Design a protein around this ligand. Structure first.
Ligand SMILES: Nc1nc2c(ncn2[C@@H]2O[C@H](COP(=O)(O)OP(=O)(O)OP(=O)(O)O)[C@@H](O)[C@H]2O)c(=O)[nH]1
Ligand SMILES: [Mg+2]
Length: 161
């Protein structure tokens, strides 16, 4: 259960981790610098699991040694912001990066985060599911802020292993 979180800056990667691991959320953006690590045991879908999580920096300058982390991980979590079409469009790139490194020997979850921002939605659930089916990855929509589907994201990934 070695998980790498990928996707564009400000989509909610860190926020999803903090929500799941610590059940908190904060509004003010602290960008991740390089690749942070968190390891903890959780009771997750009826078994104990040791979660080893790599939280990558979305900012372009930090995207050089990510290959090692992708090779090191059994699960890739690729997140976008449902309010931000570019961030969605860039998920093809991220999934490709995983595939280039592991092909079919990896669990991939595509995540449409920030659903609580309902009015500002620029990507439909439909389009998200479409992309997930086309690229053969799992799909879920979450809200780190409101606490929607975050436990489910980790559940579905843990039951995928
Ligand atoms: N409304 C809303 N805001 C969110 C949600 N998730 C994250 N945010 C906000 O969006 C901003 C970015 O969140 P981060 O968790 O720091 O995003 P990130 O993907 O880790 O960004 P980098 O580390 O720079 O790559 C912050 O201001 C968060 O408070 C969400 O589910 N809903
Ligand atoms: Mg971050």
């Amino acid at each position: 259960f070695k998980l790498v979180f990928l996707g564009e800056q400000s989509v909610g990667k860190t926020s999803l981790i903090t929500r799941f691991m610590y059940d908190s959320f904060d509004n003010t953006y602290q960008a991740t610098i390089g690749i942070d690590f968190l390891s903890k045991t959780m009771y997750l879908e009826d078994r104990t699991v040791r979660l080893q999580l790599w939280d990558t920096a979305g900012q372009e300058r930090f995207r050089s040694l990510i290959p090692s982390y992708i090779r090191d991980s059994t699960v890739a979590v690729v997140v976008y912001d449902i309010t931000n079409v570019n961030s969605f469009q860039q998920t093809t790139k991220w999934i490709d990066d995983v595939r280039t490194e592991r092909g079919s020997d990896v669990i991939i979850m595509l995540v449409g985060n920030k659903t609580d921002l309902a009015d500002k939605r620029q990507v439909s659930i439909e389009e998200g599911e479409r992309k997930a089916k086309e690229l053969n990855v799992m799909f879920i929509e979450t809200s780190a802020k409101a606490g929607y589907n975050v436990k489910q994201l980790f559940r579905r990934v843990a039951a995928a292993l």
